[PDB]
C-alpha cells in the first residue's frame, strides 16, 4: 500500500492500518474512531505480563509479517521490547508467521502467542472459547484509513466519517459483526 | 529445562561451546540481551568456557555439569551411538551450511550445476541415512 500511495497510482487504500509516528510523513491518516493497542493471546491446555514472557522462550510466540510491533520493538530502549525484536529476528524468521492464518494454526496446534493489535485478540476470543484476551493494553496508538498525502479528498472523507461518528452508526455497525 | 532460558532463569551450571565456534560468533553478533549475557558469562575467567575440540567438551559433559552448545547432526549421531546421553531441549537456532568457495573462483558454476544434479536426483537423502543411522534408545 505505502509505495502505491506514494506513487499516487491507487486513489484509495481502504485496508485498515493504525496511525504510527513514522508513517505520518508519507501518507495521510484519518482521525481515530476506535482505540487499539498491542495485546497478547494465550492458548490454554484444556505469562502474566509482557515482561514475564520477556524472560522466557519456553512458549513459542511471534507476530504478523511486516507490521508495526517489529518497528516499535527496534525503536524502543527498554529490554523487553528489544528482546522481543531479537527473538522475532532470530531463528531465521521461523518464530514469525507470514500471514495471520499461520499464527492461527500455530495457536490451534500448540501454545502460540502473537504480539498484535487487541481487536484481533478479542475477535479470536469471541470466535474461539479455548482462549481469552490476557490483561489489558500494553500501549495505545491511533487508527486511520490510508489516503494519499495532501489529497483534498481526504478532508471530505474525514468530514463524512465524522458525520457518521456523531450519530453512532459505526458503533452498531461494528456490533452486528461483533456477533 | 528445555532451552537456554531456564539456564537464563538460573546461572550456576557453567556453559559454553568449542572455540572458533559459529555458535559463539552468533552470540556475540546478536544484540539479544539474553544471548549477550551468555556471551558475557562464557567470556569470563579467561574464556575457559571454550574448548579446543568437541571431544573434550562432550567428555566433560559426561562428568561435570557442562551445558554444551553444538550443531544438531552431531547431537543426533552421539545420541544414536550412546543411550547414556540424551539431548536437552529442542532447536535453539537454525542456520544453513554451504560449500566453501574462494571469492572470485570460476568454479562456482560447475559445482553449482553438479549439486543441482545431486538435489534433483536426491541421493543426499541416501547418504544422510547411511551414516546417521542408529538403533534408537530404550
A155 class by beta-carbon count within 10 Å (0-12 exposed, 13-18 middle, 19+ buried): exposed
* Deposited experimental method: cryo-EM
Phi, psi of A141, rounded to the nearest 5 degrees: -150, 160
Residue B70, C-alpha cell as written in the block:
553444538
**A58 to chain B: which residues are within 8 Å by CB?**
2-3, 5-6
Residues of B in Cβ contact (< 8 Å) with A94: 94
Q: Is B91 left (phi over 0), alpha (psi -120 to 50) or beta?
A: beta
Nearest partner of B33 among B15, B10, B8, B14, judged by Cα: B8
Dihedral of CA A61/A65/A69/A72: which sign?
positive
Among candidate residues A26, A30, A4, A3, the one with its CA nearest the CA of residue A16: A30
Rounded to whole angstroms, how far apart are CA atoms B68 and B38?
A: 12
Number of other CB atoms surrounding residue A165 within 10 Å: 14
A91–B30 CB contact, under 8 Å = no
Distances (CA, A) of B60 to A51, A141, A163, B57: 35, 53, 74, 5
* CB-based contact, A29 to chain B, within 8 Å: no
Q: How many CB pairs under 8 A join A and B?
A: 33
* Of A134, A23, A138, A6, residue with least CA distance to A71: A23
**What would you report as the CA-atom Rg of chain A, rounded to the nearest whole angstrom?**
18
Distances (CA, A) of B87 to A83, B53, B63: 26, 19, 15
The sign of the CA dihedral A14, A154, A18, A89 is positive
Residue where the block lists cell 544484540: B31
Contact (CB, 8 A) for A99 and A65: yes
Residues 6+ apart with CB under 8 A from A48: A135
Q: What is the resolution of this structure in A?
A: 8.0
Q: Tell me the C-alpha to C-alpha distance, in Å, between residue A102 and each of A44, A91, A127.
A: 18, 17, 17
B11 annotated among ligand-binding-site residues: no
Please choose, from the candidates B131, B98, B103, the residue with its C-alpha nearest in 3D space to the C-alpha of residue B115.
Answer: B98
DSSP single-letter state for residue A22: G
Judging by DSSP bridges, how do beta strands B67-68 and A142-146 pair with one another?
unpaired
Task: Indicate yes or no: CB of B2 within 8 angstroms of CB of A58.
Answer: yes
Cα-Cα-Cα-Cα dihedral sign, residues B63, B65, B66, B71: positive
Handedness of CA A54, B6, A94, A123 (dihedral sign): negative
Task: Name the phi and psi angles at A69, rounded to 5.
Answer: -65, -35
Q: How far apart are CA A161 and CA A151, in angstroms?
A: 16
The three three-digit cell numbers of residue A81, written as one number: 521490547
Gap between the Cα atoms of B45 and B81, Å rounded? 34
Return d(Cα B74, Cα B72) in angstroms, integer.
6
The angle formed by the CA atoms of residues A42, A43 and A49, to the nearest 5 degrees, is 20
Which residues in chain A have Cβ-Cβ distances shorter than 8 Å to B94? 91-92, 94
Q: Cα(B16)–Cα(B49) distance, rounded to whole angstroms?
A: 5
Positive/negative CA dihedral, B25, B26, B28, B29: positive
**Could you tell me which of A28, A31, A100 has the C-alpha nearest to residue A62?**
A100
Amino acid at each position: 500500500m505505502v509505495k502505491e500511495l506514494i506513487d499516487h497510482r491507487a486513489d484509495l487504500a481502504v485496508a485498515p492500518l493504525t496511525i504510527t509516528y513514522v508513517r505520518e510523513k508519507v501518507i495521510d491518516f484519518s482521525k481515530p474512531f476506535m482505540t487499539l493497542g498491542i495485546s497478547i493471546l494465550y492458548r490454554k491446555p484444556n505469562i502474566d505480563s509482557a515482561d514475564d514472557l520477556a524472560k522466557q522462550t519456553k512458549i513459542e510466540y511471534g507476530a504478523v509479517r511486516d507490521g508495526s510491533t517489529m518497528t516499535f520493538f527496534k525503536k524502543s530502549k527498554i529490554s523487553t521490547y528489544e528482546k522481543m525484536w531479537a527473538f522475532m529476528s532470530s531463528r531465521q524468521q521461523s518464530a514469525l508467521v507470514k500471514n495471520s492464518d499461520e499464527g492461527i494454526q500455530r495457536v490451534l496446534t500448540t501454545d502460540y502467542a502473537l504480539l498484535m493489535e487487541s481487536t484481533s485478540i478479542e475477535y479470536v476470543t469471541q470466535r474461539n472459547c479455548n482462549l481469552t484476551q490476557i490483561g489489558g493494553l500494553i500501549d495505545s496508538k491511533g487508527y486511520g484509513v490510508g489516503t494519499p498525502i495532501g489529497s483534498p479528498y481526504r478532508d471530505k472523507i474525514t468530514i463524512a466519517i465524522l458525520q457518521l461518528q456523531e450519530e453512532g452508526k459505526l458503533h452498531m455497525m461494528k456490533e452486528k459483526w461483533w456477533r | 529445562i528445555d532451552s537456554a532460558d531456564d539456564l537464563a532463569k538460573q546461572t550456576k551450571i557453567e556453559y559454553g561451546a568449542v572455540r572458533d565456534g559459529s555458535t559463539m560468533t552468533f552470540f556475540k553478533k546478536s544484540k539479544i540481551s539474553t544471548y549477550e549475557k551468555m556471551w558475557a558469562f562464557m567470556s569470563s575467567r579467561q574464556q575457559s568456557a571454550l574448548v579446543k575440540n568437541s571431544d573434550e567438551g562432550i567428555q566433560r559433559v559426561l562428568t561435570t555439569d557442562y551445558a554444551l552448545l553444538m550443531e544438531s547432526t552431531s547431537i543426533e549421531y552421539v545420541t544414536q551411538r550412546n543411550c547414556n546421553l540424551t539431548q536437552i531441549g529442542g532447536l535453539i537456532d537454525s542456520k544453513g551450511y554451504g560449500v566453501g568457495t574462494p571469492i572470485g573462483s570460476p568454479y562456482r558454476d560447475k559445482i553449482t550445476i553438479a549439486i543441482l544434479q545431486l538435489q534433483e536426483e536426491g541421493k543426499l537423502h541416501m547418504m544422510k541415512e547411511k551414516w546417521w543411522r542408529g538403533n534408537g534408545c530404550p
